[PDB]
């Protein structure tokens with residue numbers, strides 16, 4: 333999966349923004365089939381990968397089949413972190429998306445709801461100084477989403493590697 337379109341998108345983002353750093357522990361949301369995971373596995377010390385769908389095992393990657401919107405997500409991540417001896421992760425990254433309709437407003441709406449839940453997970457588990465990378469389909473809610481969530485971070489960036497964008501938040505502050 334090292335050669336997938338999704339993998340190339342992540343390589344581009346790491347080159348430009350260093351959003352994940354060598355030795356980081358990462359919660360990866362929307363991991364299947366594993367392009368980002370394989371790119372991250374070259375750099376991260378530990379990845380906890382989450383998806384609705386099965387994907388092939390990768391040595392040392394902790395995979396959790398889970399719907400992030402449902403009731404077990406926090407217990408599942410808590411257990412995985414406990415077993416890894418990690419209190420707070422360095423990054424939360426998400427390429428999660430549901431089925432695409434081809435309609436910018438609809439795809440934005442679905443993507444926004446995913447983004448909200450990704451951020452709820454991020455603020456729960458990120459270390460001070462940690463980063464977020466998340467895919468979003470741009471729309472009405474995007475500027476307000478950024479304005480709200482960037483209050484918990486030192487800075488943010490938006491990138492486009494045709495309404496799909498990647499939002500990055502840098503340097504988490506629990507304060």
Ligand SMILES: C[S@@+](CC[C@H](N)C(=O)[O-])C[C@H]1O[C@@H](n2cnc3c(N)ncnc32)[C@H](O)[C@@H]1O
Nearest residue numbers: 338362365366367368383384399400427428429
């Ligand atoms: C664009 S694919 C991700 C590709 C991946 N980054 C790669 O490089 O192989 C999006 C993934 O998001 C997952 N996803 C969508 N909604 C989800 C949810 N509520 N909980 C967990 N995963 C979800 C889907 O099952 C799907 O596998």
